[PDB]
Design an enzyme around this catalytic site. Structure first.
Site, mmCIF file in Angstrom:
data_model
loop_
_atom_site.group_PDB
_atom_site.id
_atom_site.type_symbol
_atom_site.label_atom_id
_atom_site.label_comp_id
_atom_site.label_asym_id
_atom_site.label_seq_id
_atom_site.Cartn_x
_atom_site.Cartn_y
_atom_site.Cartn_z
ATOM 1 N N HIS A 32 0.810 -1.206 0.000
ATOM 2 C CA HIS A 32 0.000 0.000 0.000
ATOM 3 C C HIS A 32 0.847 1.262 0.000
ATOM 4 O O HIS A 32 0.326 2.326 -0.340
ATOM 5 C CB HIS A 32 -0.983 -0.015 1.174
ATOM 6 C CG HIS A 32 -2.096 -1.008 1.009
ATOM 7 N ND1 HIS A 32 -2.947 -1.352 2.039
ATOM 8 C CD2 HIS A 32 -2.478 -1.755 -0.057
ATOM 9 C CE1 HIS A 32 -3.813 -2.256 1.612
ATOM 10 N NE2 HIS A 32 -3.549 -2.519 0.344
ATOM 11 N N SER A 46 -0.813 -0.563 -6.400
ATOM 12 C CA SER A 46 -0.600 -1.667 -7.326
ATOM 13 C C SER A 46 0.080 -1.219 -8.615
ATOM 14 O O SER A 46 -0.099 -0.090 -9.086
ATOM 15 C CB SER A 46 -1.924 -2.353 -7.662
ATOM 16 O OG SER A 46 -2.383 -3.140 -6.573
ATOM 17 N N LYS A 63 -15.304 -7.353 -8.463
ATOM 18 C CA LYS A 63 -14.435 -8.169 -9.301
ATOM 19 C C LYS A 63 -13.767 -9.265 -8.478
ATOM 20 O O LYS A 63 -13.585 -10.391 -8.961
ATOM 21 C CB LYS A 63 -13.405 -7.278 -9.988
ATOM 22 C CG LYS A 63 -12.415 -8.002 -10.864
ATOM 23 C CD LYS A 63 -11.783 -7.028 -11.840
ATOM 24 C CE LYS A 63 -10.506 -7.578 -12.431
ATOM 25 N NZ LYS A 63 -10.165 -6.844 -13.684
ATOM 26 N N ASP A 64 -13.400 -8.960 -7.229
ATOM 27 C CA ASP A 64 -12.840 -9.985 -6.355
ATOM 28 C C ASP A 64 -13.893 -10.997 -5.919
ATOM 29 O O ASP A 64 -13.581 -12.180 -5.735
ATOM 30 C CB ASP A 64 -12.223 -9.351 -5.110
ATOM 31 C CG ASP A 64 -10.901 -8.680 -5.378
ATOM 32 O OD1 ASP A 64 -10.481 -8.564 -6.558
ATOM 33 O OD2 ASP A 64 -10.269 -8.283 -4.377
ATOM 34 N N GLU A 78 3.229 -34.804 -5.040
ATOM 35 C CA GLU A 78 2.190 -33.912 -5.529
ATOM 36 C C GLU A 78 2.686 -33.088 -6.707
ATOM 37 O O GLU A 78 3.876 -32.792 -6.838
ATOM 38 C CB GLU A 78 1.695 -32.992 -4.416
ATOM 39 C CG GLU A 78 1.062 -33.711 -3.237
ATOM 40 C CD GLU A 78 -0.305 -34.278 -3.593
ATOM 41 O OE1 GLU A 78 -1.112 -33.531 -4.187
ATOM 42 O OE2 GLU A 78 -0.589 -35.448 -3.261
HETATM 43 C C1 HEM Z 1 0.222 -16.403 1.137
HETATM 44 C C2 HEM Z 1 0.777 -15.921 0.012
HETATM 45 C C3 HEM Z 1 0.408 -14.549 -0.616
HETATM 46 C C4 HEM Z 1 -0.683 -13.775 -0.436
HETATM 47 C C5 HEM Z 1 -1.929 -14.022 0.454
HETATM 48 C C6 HEM Z 1 -0.512 -12.576 -1.239
HETATM 49 C C7 HEM Z 1 -1.409 -11.540 -1.346
HETATM 50 C C8 HEM Z 1 -1.274 -10.434 -2.147
HETATM 51 C C9 HEM Z 1 -2.256 -9.397 -2.363
HETATM 52 C C10 HEM Z 1 -3.668 -9.332 -1.756
HETATM 53 C C11 HEM Z 1 -1.736 -8.504 -3.199
HETATM 54 C C12 HEM Z 1 -2.444 -7.262 -3.771
HETATM 55 C C13 HEM Z 1 -3.485 -7.674 -4.812
HETATM 56 C C14 HEM Z 1 -2.877 -8.361 -6.014
HETATM 57 O O1 HEM Z 1 -1.871 -7.895 -6.609
HETATM 58 O O2 HEM Z 1 -3.450 -9.397 -6.411
HETATM 59 C C15 HEM Z 1 -0.414 -8.945 -3.572
HETATM 60 C C16 HEM Z 1 0.457 -8.289 -4.419
HETATM 61 C C17 HEM Z 1 1.720 -8.696 -4.775
HETATM 62 N N1 HEM Z 1 2.321 -9.875 -4.390
HETATM 63 FE FE1 HEM Z 1 1.458 -11.156 -3.094
HETATM 64 N N2 HEM Z 1 0.693 -12.655 -1.901
HETATM 65 C C18 HEM Z 1 1.288 -13.850 -1.535
HETATM 66 C C19 HEM Z 1 2.514 -14.310 -1.967
HETATM 67 C C20 HEM Z 1 3.382 -13.660 -2.821
HETATM 68 C C21 HEM Z 1 4.636 -14.185 -3.326
HETATM 69 C C22 HEM Z 1 5.121 -15.613 -3.012
HETATM 70 C C23 HEM Z 1 5.186 -13.260 -4.126
HETATM 71 C C24 HEM Z 1 6.487 -13.278 -4.965
HETATM 72 C C25 HEM Z 1 7.534 -14.089 -4.785
HETATM 73 C C26 HEM Z 1 4.296 -12.115 -4.129
HETATM 74 C C27 HEM Z 1 4.495 -10.936 -4.819
HETATM 75 C C28 HEM Z 1 3.584 -9.908 -4.950
HETATM 76 C C29 HEM Z 1 3.768 -8.681 -5.710
HETATM 77 C C30 HEM Z 1 5.050 -8.312 -6.495
HETATM 78 C C31 HEM Z 1 2.641 -7.967 -5.611
HETATM 79 C C32 HEM Z 1 2.357 -6.594 -6.235
HETATM 80 C C33 HEM Z 1 1.599 -6.883 -7.531
HETATM 81 C C34 HEM Z 1 1.220 -5.623 -8.270
HETATM 82 O O3 HEM Z 1 1.162 -4.551 -7.614
HETATM 83 O O4 HEM Z 1 1.022 -5.689 -9.517
HETATM 84 N N3 HEM Z 1 3.210 -12.386 -3.322
HETATM 85 N N4 HEM Z 1 -0.164 -10.116 -2.891
HETATM 86 C C1 LIG Z 2 2.965 -32.507 -0.507
HETATM 87 C C2 LIG Z 2 4.482 -32.641 -0.572
HETATM 88 C C3 LIG Z 2 5.198 -31.317 -0.759
HETATM 89 C C4 LIG Z 2 4.678 -30.140 -0.210
HETATM 90 C C5 LIG Z 2 5.332 -28.957 -0.402
HETATM 91 C C6 LIG Z 2 6.506 -28.981 -1.151
HETATM 92 O O1 LIG Z 2 7.123 -27.798 -1.323
HETATM 93 C C7 LIG Z 2 7.660 -27.261 -2.487
HETATM 94 C C8 LIG Z 2 6.945 -26.984 -3.630
HETATM 95 C C9 LIG Z 2 7.619 -26.450 -4.717
HETATM 96 C C10 LIG Z 2 8.978 -26.201 -4.667
HETATM 97 C C11 LIG Z 2 9.683 -26.488 -3.507
HETATM 98 C C12 LIG Z 2 9.025 -27.021 -2.422
HETATM 99 N N1 LIG Z 2 7.000 -30.067 -1.672
HETATM 100 C C13 LIG Z 2 6.365 -31.222 -1.487
HETATM 101 O O2 LIG Z 2 4.969 -33.337 0.622
HETATM 102 C C14 LIG Z 2 5.406 -34.587 0.302
HETATM 103 O O3 LIG Z 2 5.739 -35.404 1.098
HETATM 104 N N2 LIG Z 2 5.359 -34.694 -1.085
HETATM 105 N N3 LIG Z 2 5.765 -35.764 -1.898
HETATM 106 C C15 LIG Z 2 7.123 -36.234 -1.994
HETATM 107 C C16 LIG Z 2 7.449 -37.568 -2.163
HETATM 108 C C17 LIG Z 2 8.781 -37.935 -2.283
HETATM 109 C C18 LIG Z 2 9.776 -36.974 -2.249
HETATM 110 C C19 LIG Z 2 9.434 -35.640 -2.095
HETATM 111 C C20 LIG Z 2 8.106 -35.270 -1.978
HETATM 112 C C21 LIG Z 2 4.824 -33.606 -1.700
HETATM 113 O O4 LIG Z 2 4.663 -33.453 -2.881
#
Ligand code: HEM
Ligand SMILES: C[C@@]1(c2ccc(Oc3ccccc3)nc2)OC(=O)N(Nc2ccccc2)C1=O
Ligand SMILES: CCCCCCCCCCCCCCCCCC(=O)OC[C@H](COP(=O)([O-])OCC(O)COP(=O)([O-])OC[C@@H](COC(=O)CCCCCCCCCCCCCCCCC)OC(=O)CCCCCCCCCCCCCCCCC)OC(=O)CCCCCCCCCCCCCCCCC
Ligand SMILES: CCCCCCCCCCCCCCCCCC(=O)OC[C@H](COP(=O)([O-])OCC(O)COP(=O)([O-])OC[C@@H](COC(=O)CCCCCCCCCCCCCCCCC)OC(=O)CCCCCCCCCCCCCCCCC)OC(=O)CCCCCCCCCCCCCCCCC
Ligand SMILES: CCCCCCCCCCCCCCCC(=O)OC[C@H](COP(=O)(O)OCCN)OC(=O)CCCCCCCCCCCCCCC
Ligand SMILES: CCCCCCCCCCCCCCCCCC(=O)OC[C@H](COP(=O)(O)OCCN)OC(=O)CCCCCCCCCCCCC
Ligand SMILES: CCCCCCCCCCCCCC(=O)OC[C@H](COP(=O)(O)OCC[N+](C)(C)C)OC(=O)CCCCCCCCCCCCC
Ligand SMILES: CCCCCCCCCCCCCC(=O)OC[C@H](COP(=O)(O)OCC[N+](C)(C)C)OC(=O)CCCCCCCCCCCCC
Ligand code: HEM
Ligand SMILES: CCCCCC(=O)OC[C@H](COP(=O)([O-])OCCN)OC(=O)CCCCC
Ligand SMILES: CCCCCC(=O)OC[C@H](COP(=O)([O-])OCCN)OC(=O)CCCCC
Ligand SMILES: [Cl-]
Lengths: 49, 105, 49, 48, 49, 377, 75, 61, 49
Positions: free
Chosen positions: F199, F203, F225-226, F269
């Site tokens: 914020h 965005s 939209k959400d 998975e």
């Molecule tokens: C539990 C995981 C996550 C949640 C709940 C979350 C939630 C959100 C929300 C609500 C926004 C603002 C709305 C939107 O852009 O859709 C946002 C923006 C953003 N998120 Fe996340 N996020 C998560 C994980 C991540 C991860 C793993 C990354 C990158 C490695 C990331 C990068 C970003 C970026 C760069 C923005 C800004 C996007 C823009 O302004 O265009 N987020 N996130």
């Molecule tokens: C659900 C799961 C899991 C969850 C989360 C998880 O994180 C990552 C996802 C993406 C990138 C890096 C980490 N990576 C596996 O946990 C689990 O035991 N396996 N299967 C399994 C069987 C044999 C060997 C290895 C894994 C899965 O696929």
């Protein structure tokens, strides 16, 4: 020079009732709101269920 | 100098149309990423160029919302694209490098 | 007046043949338009109800 | 192995029917509000 | 990020190398102490117990 | 006006109602709220699964069956929780891919906080998969936990310390349950700091151009939209839960865990298959484990590899092709990850692993520089 | 968090808007929407498609090769 | 029915939010009875022999 | 807190008693509907199933 400003024509966006310049919008005021608020009420009913 | 120069410029005009920002009425300098050097250059723009930059970006965002482009007549022609911001940005960069060179001694 | 939301406002009822403009107009600082709109509409709804 | 089989299929049918109702209605609510913006028109009139 | 290569920046690094060396001794001794690292502590005289 | 002055509602107003948002954010900006919907879905379903779950190795398998057989609607809650976890990873990868394409990583604090959120959700889902105590649960715990044994000179101690013994056993499952319970709440807290830093700037949008000249309030435009996108998330979830609840799972997990025999066709998975494929393309133990970690931690380096003078790829055709070569390459590693280690999959997986890191480190930054020169700046 | 009235500077731009109860929510949905989808598909097909086509050919070859190698050959 | 149907629904039920909510809660009541009734009748028609309530007559006791 | 006893405040209450009566019907029907209250629903005609 601000009197040279005219609002553009929305005719290809307006609903059928409100396209006549010589017809009051009060006529279809009742129906237009009900159509849109009916959609909202139905959505709440589905979410409610 | 037409033979080799026009082929390079021909590939640049190809890329310009492929980039497609001209399809929204934008110019090249409208698309640059705003870092601190670019915010200062935009700040230094005269009234008319600033106001023109604002409306073109506003018109492009409106198009992007609607997933539309301008008619082909209104596309930014490659030869008519004015790099209105580049000279200001070049000076802003030149000033920052001067500060950095003084910060070294 | 207390919150300095505007420099002026006026209500009006402009009449024409079988139509008219009923409402208000105001003048304010750029960070006060939203509050004036809010208080204005709140009074319309308050008088309606 | 899957005693819930029959009940899950009955629920699946109800889920599809409600989604077939709710998806176009909620879609319609989105477009209704957004129509203010989607049909907006812009004009640029700078002093010369 | 070439701007940090200059006479002033190498005078600045020379002023802070005694401090950073000592914060490495703090962390090294702190890591050996917190983990009871037998590989290093067998050599300290009185600690041997 | 009272939405703005109350100490508590002012936070809600400045985040969901009066928040200035770009007028042109596409459907790819919907996954942020869907990630929060997923996080709230998993907490509710998960909490109701802990009311009828026991972390005893001798009854952990049976307590899950007790849910799906005797608990009133316990099965539907159970399969929402399992499929909800997969939907969580669908939204994560689209959220990440959105940010890579459109250059949203230039928000360093938000991006880096994002990488932390990805890793904790990964750790959470891994431990969740160990709880039902099937065959893949146990051997999933065996393989992934043994990755720490690759750390030189302390690896076995970290592994045995985490296991609570010389192998995965009852002590390992009970603590994985405690971690799996609490880690989602830490994620929710970190998701708030994620939004806090966002914020500050607002965005990004598809054009990568500043949108302060054309902003609209979040309400009613992006509330509805959400809401629409959430209904589509529920549709995607309920199709799995109500028509194919085992399509994304493994059948061997319906057999109780057995430490004495490993199944022949290990298949994780789907959301781990691309990184599983990266690891085994390296036969060296420590080398393959480092390549696994770097295939994810490389996201923290993407901001430093940005070379283009434009933020978004909307106006960058050469970067677009390399971007989609990365998606198809990741789709290849996911495929190779689901196949056994044999010819020709070994060589394909090696070439795809090189292409993955080659695209991020070399090709994509060089494309951004070629594009700058083509535009003469 | 930024707020309206403090975002940026704009001059000489007029916006005309129509009430949502005055216009259609689905104006020319198919008569205009389908042409726009085809325009957008054409503009991006060459950037998105060839990578996944390349994946499809590598996928099928690798699976075909793996199947034939598992079948034995006469000595 | 000279006035529009949607027009009369608005003046009577949707203008006030209170009656707009009452029509929804009363609608969900009657919608739930008719939707479950029709949905179950469809699931049962496709599976006319298969269900238990289609075989409960054999096992009188 | 005697200040709310006056002719204006009793005119204000009279304007809002029709609305509050209806929000009671919303909550009453909503409570009966959400809980499947058999004590009340046995009397409704079509619901009986
Ligand atoms: C539990 C995981 C996550 C949640 C709940 C979350 C939630 C959100 C929300 C609500 C926004 C603002 C709305 C939107 O852009 O859709 C946002 C923006 C953003 N998120 Fe996340 N996020 C998560 C994980 C991540 C991860 C793993 C990354 C990158 C490695 C990331 C990068 C970003 C970026 C760069 C923005 C800004 C996007 C823009 O302004 O265009 N987020 N996130
Ligand atoms: C659900 C799961 C899991 C969850 C989360 C998880 O994180 C990552 C996802 C993406 C990138 C890096 C980490 N990576 C596996 O946990 C689990 O035991 N396996 N299967 C399994 C069987 C044999 C060997 C290895 C894994 C899965 O696929
Ligand atoms: C089944 C699962 C669904 C798969 C999703 C496919 C992804 C996609 O393109 O969706 C666009 C869809 C529209 O997004 P948008 O914000 O309008 O634009 C996104 C980009 O700007 C889009 O970039 P663009 O401007 O270059 O547009 C690309 C073009 C994409 O066009 C295509 O390639 C699809 C054409 C299919 C022909 C349909 C004939 C039948 O998008 C469209 O024209 C919209 C799709 C219309 C679908 C019509 C189906 C009938 O995006 C999403 O919602 C993301 C995926 C949603 C998943 C739904 C499942 C839950
Ligand atoms: C996992 C969950 C994933 C999250 C999804 C995020 C949802 C989201 O952002 O909102 C949906 C996103 C919202 O964008 P929008 O409001 O349609 O704006 C479109 C742009 O204005 C662009 O305007 P346009 O005029 O170019 O759009 C043409 C139309 C696509 O073109 C068509 O008219 C396709 C019609 C094909 C039927 C052919 C019969 C002749 O737009 C669409 O993309 C709609 C696709 C819906 C296809 C089904 C229609 C029934 O649109 C969709 O993808 C629609 C999905 C909603 C369900 C439709 C139920 C009917
Ligand atoms: C404390 C409570 C916490 C709740 C947390 C829930 C988290 C949200 C999960 C979303 C689940 C989607 C609906 C499942 C439907 C189901 O499974 O219902 C199965 C029932 C039939 O059931 P039946 O055949 O037994 O007949 C029932 C006995 N008369 O019909 C349905 O399909 C209705 C669903 C319609 C299609 C989905 C529409 C989605 C709308 C979203 C509303 C979400 C409410 C949010 C609540 C927090
Ligand atoms: C990590 C492990 C992942 C394992 C799973 C891998 C399976 C992948 C399966 C393929 C998924 C394909 C998703 C659909 C992509 C549709 C692309 C599209 O519609 O066209 C490109 C689109 C063009 O839109 P512009 O914004 O450029 O301009 C619009 C002007 N009208 O531009 C866009 O819309 C691009 C937006 C970003 C797309 C995000 C896809 C990312 C895929 C995952 C990335 C993972 C990274 C770690
Ligand atoms: C791998 C393992 C690595 C670990 C290695 C061990 C590291 C040991 C700590 C070394 C750092 C000490 C630095 C330090 O003391 O500064 C912080 C403050 C300021 O001290 P102060 O004397 O006020 O002023 C310092 C001025 N100086 C340096 C010129 C003398 O001094 C303090 O305030 C510190 C003493 C306050 C203790 C109370 C705070 C702890 C939390 C409360 C716990 C008890 C209640 C639950
Ligand atoms: C003891 C149990 C008690 C429960 C009894 C049941 C109560 C049922 C609800 C009754 C209240 C309805 C009031 C209402 O609709 O107002 C809220 C908004 C505004 O409606 P709107 O039509 O936009 O304008 C109203 C103007 N009017 C009144 C003059 C016609 O209307 C809405 O927006 C509501 C419909 C939106 C549904 C989506 C929001 C729900 C969360 C999202 C869930 C789906 C995605 C996961
Ligand atoms: C980000 C949030 C979460 C994710 C991604 C997640 C993911 C998972 C996954 C993939 C499983 C394996 C399901 C299976 O194999 O059947 C699982 C199981 C489980 N989870 Fe979670 N979970 C989350 C949060 C929670 C929370 C907050 C709780 C409790 C308060 C919880 C309680 C459980 C329990 C008791 C099980 C074992 C029952 C079962 O196997 O279905 N989870 N979780
Ligand atoms: C990062 C977490 C490190 C925790 C590793 C650990 O369990 O430490 C145990 C060893 C014990 O010392 P040792 O002489 O028995 O040696 C036994 C060798 N296994 O202490 C150490 O070696 C600490 C090393 C710290 C390096 C960062
Ligand atoms: C505040 C939480 C209330 C939950 C109580 C509850 O479990 O409701 C069950 C009864 C069932 O209706 P009944 O006709 O079987 O009657 C059976 C009597 N035991 O429905 C009701 O009576 C709902 C009453 C609501 C009052 C607030
Ligand atoms: Cl099981």
């Amino acid at each position: 020079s601000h009197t040279d400003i005219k609002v553009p024509d929305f005719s290809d966006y307006r609903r059928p009732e409100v396209l006549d310049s010589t017809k009051s919008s009060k006529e279809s005021s009742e129906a237009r709101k009900g159509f849109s608020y009916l959609v909202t009420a139905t959505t709440t009913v589905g979410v409610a269920y | 100098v037409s033979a080799s120069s026009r082929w390079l410029e021909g590939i640049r005009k190809w890329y310009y149309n492929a980039a497609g920002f001209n399809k929204l009425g934008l110019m090249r300098d409208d698309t640059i990423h705003e870092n601190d050097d670019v915010k200062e250059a935009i700040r230094r723009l005269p009234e008319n160029l600033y106001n023109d930059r604002v409306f073109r970006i506003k018109r492009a965002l409106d198009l992007s919302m609607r997933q539309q482009i301008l008619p082909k007549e209104q596309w930014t022609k490659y030869e008519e694209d004015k790099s209105y911001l580049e000279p200001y940005l070049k000076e802003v960069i030149r000033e920052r490098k001067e500060r950095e060179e003084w910060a070294k001694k | 007046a207390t919150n300095k939301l505007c420099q002026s406002f006026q209500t009006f009822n402009i009449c024409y043949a079988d139509t008219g403009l009923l409402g208000a107009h105001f003048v304010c600082d750029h960070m006060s338009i939203d509050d004036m709109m809010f208080v204005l509409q709140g009074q319309w709804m308050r008088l309606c109800t | 192995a899957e005693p819930e089989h029959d009940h899950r299929k009955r629920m699946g049918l109800k889920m599809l029917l409600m989604m077939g109702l709710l998806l176009p209605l909620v879609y319609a609510m989105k477009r209704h509000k957004w129509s203010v913006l989607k049909s907006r028109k812009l004009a640029y009139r700078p002093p010369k | 990020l070439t701007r940090f290569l200059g006479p002033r920046y190498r005078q600045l690094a020379r002023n802070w190398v005694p401090t950073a060396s000592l914060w490495g001794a703090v962390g090294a001794v702190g890591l050996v102490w917190a983990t009871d690292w037998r590989l290093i502590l067998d050599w300290v005289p009185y600690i041997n117990g | 006006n009272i939405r703005k002055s109350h100490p508590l509602m002012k936070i809600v107003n400045n985040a969901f109602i009066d928040l200035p948002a770009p007028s042109n954010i596409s459907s790819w900006w919907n996954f942020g709220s869907l990630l929060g919907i997923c996080l709230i879905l998993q907490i509710l379903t998960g909490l109701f699964l802990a009311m009828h779950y026991t972390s005893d190795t001798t009854t952990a398998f049976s307590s899950v069956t007790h849910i799906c057989r005797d608990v009133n609607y316990g099965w539907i809650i159970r399969y929402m929780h399992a499929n909800g976890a997969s939907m969580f990873f669908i939204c994560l990868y689209m959220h990440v891919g959105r940010g890579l394409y459109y250059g949203s990583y230039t928000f360093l604090e938000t991006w880096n906080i994002g990488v932390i959120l990805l890793l904790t959700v990964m750790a959470t889902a891994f431990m969740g998969y160990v709880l039902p105590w099937g065959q893949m649960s146990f051997w999933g715990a065996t393989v992934i936990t043994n990755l720490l044994s690759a750390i030189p000179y302390i690896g076995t101690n970290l592994v045995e310390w985490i296991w609570g013994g010389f192998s995965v056993d009852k002590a390992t499952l009970t603590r994985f349950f405690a971690f799996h319970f609490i880690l989602p709440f830490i994620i929710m807290a970190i998701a708030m700091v994620h939004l806090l830093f966002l914020h500050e700037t607002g965005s990004n949008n598809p054009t990568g151009i500043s949108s302060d000249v054309d902003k609209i309030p979040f309400h009613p435009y992006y509330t509805i939209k959400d809401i629409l996108g959430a209904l589509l998330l529920i549709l995607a979830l309920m199709l799995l839960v109500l028509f194919a609840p085992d399509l994304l799972g493994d059948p061997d997990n319906y057999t109780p865990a057995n430490p004495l025999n490993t199944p022949p066709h290990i298949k994780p998975e789907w959301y781990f298959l691309f990184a599983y494929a990266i690891l085994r393309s390296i036969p060296n133990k420590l080398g393959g484990v480092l390549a696994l970690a770097f295939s994810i931690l490389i996201l923290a380096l993407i901001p430093l590899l940005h070379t283009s003078k434009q933020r978004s790829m909307m106006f960058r055709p050469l970067s677009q092709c390399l971007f989609w070569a990365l998606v198809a390459d990741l789709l290849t590693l996911t495929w190779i990850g689901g196949q056994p280690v044999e010819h020709p999959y070994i060589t394909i997986g090696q070439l795809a692993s090189v292409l993955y890191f080659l695209l991020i480190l070399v090709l994509m930054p060089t494309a951004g520089t070629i594009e700058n020169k083509l535009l003469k700046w | 968090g930024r707020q309206f009235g403090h975002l940026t500077r704009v001059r000489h731009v007029i916006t005309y808007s129509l009430s949502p109860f005055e216009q259609r929510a689905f104006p020319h949905y198919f008569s205009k929407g389908i042409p726009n989808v085809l325009r957008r598909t054409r503009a991006c097909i060459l950037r998105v498609a060839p990578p996944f086509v390349a994946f499809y050919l590598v996928y099928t070859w690798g699976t075909q090769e793996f199947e034939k190698s598992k079948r034995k050959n006469p000595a | 029915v000279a006035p529009t149907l949607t027009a009369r629904l608005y003046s009577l039920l949707f203008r006030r939010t209170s009656t707009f909510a009452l029509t929804i809660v009363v609608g969900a009541l009657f919608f739930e009875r008719a939707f479950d009734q029709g949905a179950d009748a469809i699931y049962e028609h496709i599976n006319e022999g298969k269900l238990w309530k289609h075989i409960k007559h054999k096992y009188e006791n």
